[PDB]
């Protein structure tokens, strides 16, 4: 399906995805598209910080579900 990863700047990222995928896989997809390491990514949906272990099936999802992306940049 198609989901949207929204950042604090307002940039919308259209990502290919499936309910079988987990948050770890989504962060891996973001890394392939934005170059941001998964450990420096925090995916938030509906006000909850998603866990890497749990899948997209664990939480709710749709063909228009928008996720929030927060970064923990490291130097």
């Amino acid at each position: 399906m198609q989901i949207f990863v929204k950042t604090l700047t307002g940039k919308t990222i259209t990502l290919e995805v499936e309910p079988s995928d987990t948050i770890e896989n989504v962060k891996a997809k973001i890394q392939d598209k934005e170059g941001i390491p998964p450990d420096q990514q925090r995916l938030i949906f509906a006000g909850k910080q998603l866990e890497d272990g749990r899948t997209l099936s664990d939480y709710n999802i749709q063909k228009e579900s928008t996720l929030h992306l927060v970064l923990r940049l490291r130097g």
Binding site: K11, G47, V70, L73, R74
Partner: protein, 286 residues
């Protein structure tokens, strides 16, 4: 028509390495970082508007995970002794420090505030998990030993370890995909200003790397003092990282939702300027 600046000198690192000054002159310049931050208008914008102010150049950054700590040594000599010592001191201050209770309040309050911007609301367990993660990053567990890279709050703790202010020159946005949180001013607020170094440690951040900022004359050891402005190119005051401390009487659940309570702890401009003038020599120039 007047901006606040700070006349700083390079740290006296004699007791750690008596030939440290020589390592500064010997050191490379991070040309990649210099060009990036200059063309972004974050570095050396002040030279044109403020005469009698030298250009700041980034020293060589590292790739072993201790670039932040390595910047406090301003030389090659840090690599196999000090850089790891400072990292260990960083870890210790977070775990068994005497001001760790207050440092945690400053961290959580700012994190709670920034969490609103995404609609994020941490559970009491998630707060415990995030704090443990910060300390884990400051550990000396490898994976040529490579150490974990450090976050924004670790810079704030470093200011307490060095007992000196830290001014970071960096971009505000990531090439605009996401905000860059490192730029701004870091004050050792849990340490009495009288017991701190007056001159701040001026750093630069670019592409997940930290570097010390020096003037050309400070590198060749021909002039002790240089100038760092406490505002951006648009003359807006730099962010004060983790400056707000809500106090022990701050109930995290209720008070965070209370707008009146938040207003009572949110710093004004007058308070911000007082804090800056307490830990740094702030000179206003036209």
């Amino acid at each position: 028509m007047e901006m606040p600046i700070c006349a700083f000198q390079l740290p006296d690192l004699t007791v750690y390495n008596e030939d440290f000054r020589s390592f500064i002159e010997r050191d490379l310049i991070e040309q990649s970082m210099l060009v990036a931050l200059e063309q972004a208008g974050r570095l050396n914008w002040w030279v044109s508007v403020d005469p009698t102010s030298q250009r700041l150049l980034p020293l060589a950054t590292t790739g072993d995970g201790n670039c932040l700590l390595h910047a406090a040594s301003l030389g090659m000599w840090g690599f196999h002794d000090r850089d790891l010592m400072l990292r260990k001191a960083l870890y210790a201050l977070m775990e068994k420090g005497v001001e760790k209770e207050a440092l945690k309040r400053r961290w959580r309050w700012q994190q709670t505030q920034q969490n609103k911007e995404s609609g994020l609301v941490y559970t009491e367990d998630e707060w415990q998990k995030e704090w443990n993660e910060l300390i884990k990053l400051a550990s000396s567990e490898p994976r040529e030993p490579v150490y974990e890279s450090l976050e924004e709050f670790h810079v704030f703790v470093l200011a307490h370890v060095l007992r000196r202010p830290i001014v970071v020159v960096a971009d505000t946005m990531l090439r605009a995909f996401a905000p860059i949180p490192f730029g701004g001013i870091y004050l050792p607020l849990e340490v009495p200003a009288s017991q701190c170094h007056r001159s701040p440690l001026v750093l630069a951040y670019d592409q997940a790397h930290f570097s010390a900022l020096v003037s050309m004359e400070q590198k060749e050891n021909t002039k002790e003092q240089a100038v760092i402005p406490l505002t951006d190119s648009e003359y807006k005051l730099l962010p004060l990282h983790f400056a707000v401390d809500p106090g022990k009487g701050w109930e995290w659940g209720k008070d965070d939702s209370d707008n009146v309570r938040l207003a009572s702890v949110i710093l004004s401009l007058e308070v911000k300027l007082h804090l800056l003038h307490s830990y740094m020599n702030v000179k206003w120039i036209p």
